[PDB]
């Protein structure tokens, strides 16, 4: 029985050396350095369009590469594809099981996928010969429910399942290629880097890990939260990422040095965080709280600089466009709004 | 007006798409949806098999009775955390709950000190006192009765329950169990519990489910127009 004890003290002294090297490397906080910059005055953004037509809660939304088309999913069982400029609809793809919680859009605008509670990721084809929408493939190799899936390419997809694992699939063959494991809780958040070489996932127990698609093993881990991780997004540079949580606290980390840089917390908020997305130049950190309104948290100054309260229920999804022209937020009242 | 020749054709597509969406959104709004829950050995399989059927992960069962469409979501294959995927079941008419009467002297696996009725009551407390299910009624089922009678005949009831003053009679033991299960209900003004004992006749079970659903519908309609 001594082997488990010696391995446990070995891991403990390894963690001690890691935290010592982490503490010795940091000299001062980022807020102290950025004390000679003029902050933004006030971000006054008014609604422009109101995309209506859903009949249930909304759980996902993704922007196309053309910054014109967006796709949204609801518990009603539809995958409507909206047009942002003209507000007309383009498709009404139905679903087999009316329990969906994620969506994605192909970088070329060809495929659209959506998982759900039935632990099956189905991929639809939009450029078929006929006028309908067919199911190209149905991937089923996970035990727990699927939480979020993004298209790494036109032929590869990465999914985040609920059974403490993440796997990379292949569309042509239909079987998973590589599986990433190591998490202790339900993985429910991930986002791809701009160069599509690395990606990070947010565990369910105050943990965020970094994965590589080629080699396929955990490289670095970050901690510091209390409750859990609920949203992940990279910096536009691709060299940092800011994560949400449930205890009204979103933080920003660094990839080169596993250190904590800034914490965006306020004494007037005690509500969770659902979605986090950056801006075009990495200056505005939009965050959607579950207290019926959003926030325009500044990225470098850690002070609120705007409130988008035009909603009825809790917001569950929001994302900035590719060119930084507008932001779209979707709440549980089946109403999408375009802010500019 | 300002629209071009073919731009007006795209606007007509939005109209028919919205029409097809509204036509289907109304057909699925006139059917009763009810959730199923229970322990691993709570006899949920025999309940879902005994009732009429017309139809891993979630399983949906569709059946009709007295010109009503019922949907039964059996969330039993989800091994993940329950607090993450429980908010999507906010809109539901009833919550079927099934427990086993004879399952009170059988200890749970890989454990010799904790009884299964304990975690049954814990699950019932977590389901009834949840912050989402504060308005939906709960239908309760007792699966086994003859095996329960045999067990209380050969084995006393005091092994599971620490305090008991009555005799070893099924007529009073069932009433005691029902009164204990109805006690774990904090929200006593916004929800009600309908209890029933599963028998060999499927017609009685289907009739009880239909009666409970009709009562919930009547209460909802009365509370809709602010009449009571």
């Amino acid at each position, epitope marked *: 029985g001594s082997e488990l004890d010696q391995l446990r003290q070995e891991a403990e002294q390894l963690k001690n050396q890691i935290r010592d090297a982490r503490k010795a490397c940091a000299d001062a906080t980022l807020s102290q350095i950025t004390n000679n910059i003029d902050p933004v005055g006030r971000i006054q953004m008014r609604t422009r369009r109101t995309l209506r037509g859903h009949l249930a809660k909304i759980y996902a939304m993704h922007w196309g590469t053309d910054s014109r088309l967006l796709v949204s999913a609801s518990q009603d069982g539809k995958l409507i594809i909206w*047009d942002s400029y003209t507000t007309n609809k383009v498709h009404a793809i139905p679903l087999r099981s009316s329990w969906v919680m994620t969506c994605a859009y192909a970088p070329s605008g060809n495929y659209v996928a959506c998982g759900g509670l039935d632990n099956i990721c189905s991929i639809y084809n939009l450029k078929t010969r006929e*006028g309908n929408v067919r199911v190209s493939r149905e991937l089923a190799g996970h035990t727990g429910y699927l939480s979020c899936c993004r298209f790494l390419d036109d032929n590869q997809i990465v999914t985040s399942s609920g059974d403490t694992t993440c796997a990379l699939w292949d569309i042509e063959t239909g079987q998973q290629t590589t599986t990433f494991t190591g998490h202790t809780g339900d993985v429910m958040s991930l986002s791809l880097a701009p160069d599509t070489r690395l990606f990070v996932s947010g565990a369910c127990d105050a943990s965020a890990k970094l994965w590589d698609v080629r080699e396929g093993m955990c490289r670095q881990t970050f901690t510091g939260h209390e409750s859990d991780i609920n949203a992940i997004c990279f910096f536009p540079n691709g060299n940092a990422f800011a994560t949400g949580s449930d205890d009204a606290t979103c933080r920003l980390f660094d990839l080169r040095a596993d250190q904590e840089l800034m914490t965006y917390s306020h004494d007037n908020i005690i509500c969770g965080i659902t979605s986090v997305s950056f801006s075009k130049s990495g200056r505005l950190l939009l965050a959607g709280y579950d207290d019926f309104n959003c926030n325009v948290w500044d990225a470098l100054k850690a002070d609120r600089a705007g409130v988008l309260a035009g909603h009825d229920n809790r917001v569950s999804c929001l994302g900035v466009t590719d060119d930084g022209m507008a932001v779209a937020t979707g709440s549980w009242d089946s109403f999408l709004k375009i802010w500019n | 007006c300002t629209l071009s020749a073919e731009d007006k*054709a795209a606007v007509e597509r939005s109209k028919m798409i919205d029409r097809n969406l509204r036509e289907d959104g109304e057909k699925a709004a006139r059917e009763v949806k009810l959730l199923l829950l229970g322990a691993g050995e709570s006899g949920k399989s025999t309940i879902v098999k005994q009732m009429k059927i017309i139809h891993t992960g979630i399983v949906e069962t569709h059946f009709t009775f007295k010109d009503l469409h019922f949907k039964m979501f059996d969330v039993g294959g989800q091994r993940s955390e329950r607090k993450k995927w429980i908010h999507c079941f906010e809109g539901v008419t009833a919550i079927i709950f099934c427990v086993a009467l004879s399952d009170y002297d059988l200890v749970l696996a890989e454990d010799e000190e904790m009884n299964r009725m304990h975690e049954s009551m814990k699950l019932f407390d977590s389901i009834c006192n949840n912050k989402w299910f504060t308005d939906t009624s709960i239908i309760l089922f007792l699966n086994k009765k003859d095996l329960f009678e045999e067990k209380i005949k050969k084995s006393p009831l005091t092994i599971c329950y620490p305090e008991y003053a009555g005799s070893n009679t099924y007529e009073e033991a069932a009433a005691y169990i029902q009164c204990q299960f109805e006690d774990l209900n904090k929200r006593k003004d916004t929800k009600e519990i309908y209890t029933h004992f599963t028998c060999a006749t499927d017609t009685k079970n289907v009739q009880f489910v239909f009666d409970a659903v009709t009562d919930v519908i009547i209460k909802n309609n009365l509370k809709d127009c602010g009449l009571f």
Partner: single-chain antibody
Amino acid sequence: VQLVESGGGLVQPGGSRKLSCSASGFAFSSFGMHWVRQAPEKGLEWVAYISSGSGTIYYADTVKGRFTISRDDPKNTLFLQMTSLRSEDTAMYYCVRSIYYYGSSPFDFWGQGTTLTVSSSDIVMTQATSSVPVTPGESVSISCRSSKSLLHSNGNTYLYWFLQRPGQSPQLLIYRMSNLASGVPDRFSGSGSGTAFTLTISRLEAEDVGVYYCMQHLEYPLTFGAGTKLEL
């Protein structure tokens, strides 16, 4: 997909026969239908259109009030009836599917066509020339001119372009100003400014010869060109 025409026979003046076409292999219930009349040794001209769901029915100014047309969705069959018939209605008849949304390709699949023989403001679009002699392996430039500015306020010209093989039905080549259609090689390219449009071909082979046409879609009364022939 498959399309075929039926109801082709010699009809005396003053008599009427209905035209029927059957479509199978796609969702006919969500495709608009266009009819196209092709006179012998002449350019083809638009005839009629029906939208998805029979919501908007349009006609041409020449045959207005004289042709009755309808759709049958359950059987995927299209019908065309006329009341009066004259000596100039002797021409080929084609049907072409078209669906209009963001990023769509109208007039994608042309029908086979039938033969009909009879025995007895708007946009002006004129092509450059009637025929050009071209030796193989040389670039060709074809110019189609219009009398109006096709460029709309949205920012996209509405001048389509397609080729007709000798003895077969024409096929779409290039929608809008530049986008290439599906299935056609990338040799064909087009450009424009708003008034004068041109098309350039990189390499020319023997399997792509015939006549060319340029269509307009800015204002609804569609008009085609005269038709420039390519000689091998």
